[PDB]
């Protein structure tokens, strides 16, 4: 009789990250209970730059302080953008789905350094430090946040418990919908800080199950330039399936 290796979801997710030859953590929160998965659990309490995940908070601050509205069309003013898909006029919500940096730089500059630092410190996001550069403080420092802090933030968003108006949080939630099928909804925001070393990849969001239960997640991993952007989505979805969340 041979031995049998018993692969629980903890071992599977740890080895999912090992297979990509990188370090990563998946933070899960539901019913005010947080679980850690992956091959680098100490990442969960390490500060990283939020990169494009900060768009969620940018949008909340801009809508709450009436610097924009969900129907405003941000015009493409003619510079070569990083992707041709970004070279069009679009709303805040379309820019959220596309992670269209220049729209959120326009919004950040409307908010202004003063209001932004004060709203970020009021929310208590991460180390709550934005420095003097209002258009990149979430990409190159000084703002940093742990994956646990991101799961706590996004779970509050999903529950409309952040210190913002209900309608503002509801509108930002609708910008983050990624997938709907069979009574499940998945919301989230990817991020990838390429200019810092080591690079950091994010995928933060939540699942709404058919009975309404919310299961929030923050995936955080080291990226390398040869990786496809979809590696974050692949690792998230396989792990969510292994955990029976979807
Ligand atoms: C968000 O974090 C990031 C901001 C910081 O620019 C943004 C908008 C770009 C990317 S992907 C990035 C651009 N092209 C690189 C690439 O694919 N290769 C081949 C290295 C990485 C993202 C993202 O989340 O994917 N968002």
Curated annotation (Swiss-Prot):
Q: Which GO terms describe its molecular function?
A: hydrolase activity; penicillin binding
Active-site residues are 52
Tell me any Pfam family this protein matches: Transpeptidase
Subcellular location field: Periplasm
Q: Which residues carry this modification: N6-carboxylysine?
A: 55
Q: What class of enzyme is it?
A: hydrolase
Entry EC no(s): 3.5.2.6
Hydrolase keyword on record: yes
The alphabetical list of record keywords is: Antibiotic resistance, Hydrolase, Periplasm, Plasmid, Signal
The UniProt annotation places a beta-lactam binding at 52, 55, 99, 190, 192, 232
Q: What induces it?
A: Expression may be regulated by promoter elements associated with upstream insertion elements, such as ISAba1 or ISAba10.
Q: Does the keyword RNA-binding apply?
A: no
Catalyzed chemical reaction(s)? a beta-lactam + H2O = a substituted beta-amino acid
**What is known about what this protein does?**
Class D beta-lactamase which confers resistance to the beta-lactam antibiotics, including ampicillin, and carbapenems such as imipenem and meropenem. Acts via hydrolysis of the beta-lactam ring. Has penicillin-, cephalosporin- and carbapenem-hydrolyzing activities, but lacks ceftazidime-hydrolyzing activity.
Q: Which family is it part of?
A: Belongs to the class-D beta-lactamase family.
Please give the PANTHER family that the UniProt record associates with this protein. Answer: BETA-LACTAMASE YBXI-RELATED, PEPTIDOGLYCAN D,D-TRANSPEPTIDASE
- This chain's protein is named Beta-lactamase OXA-23
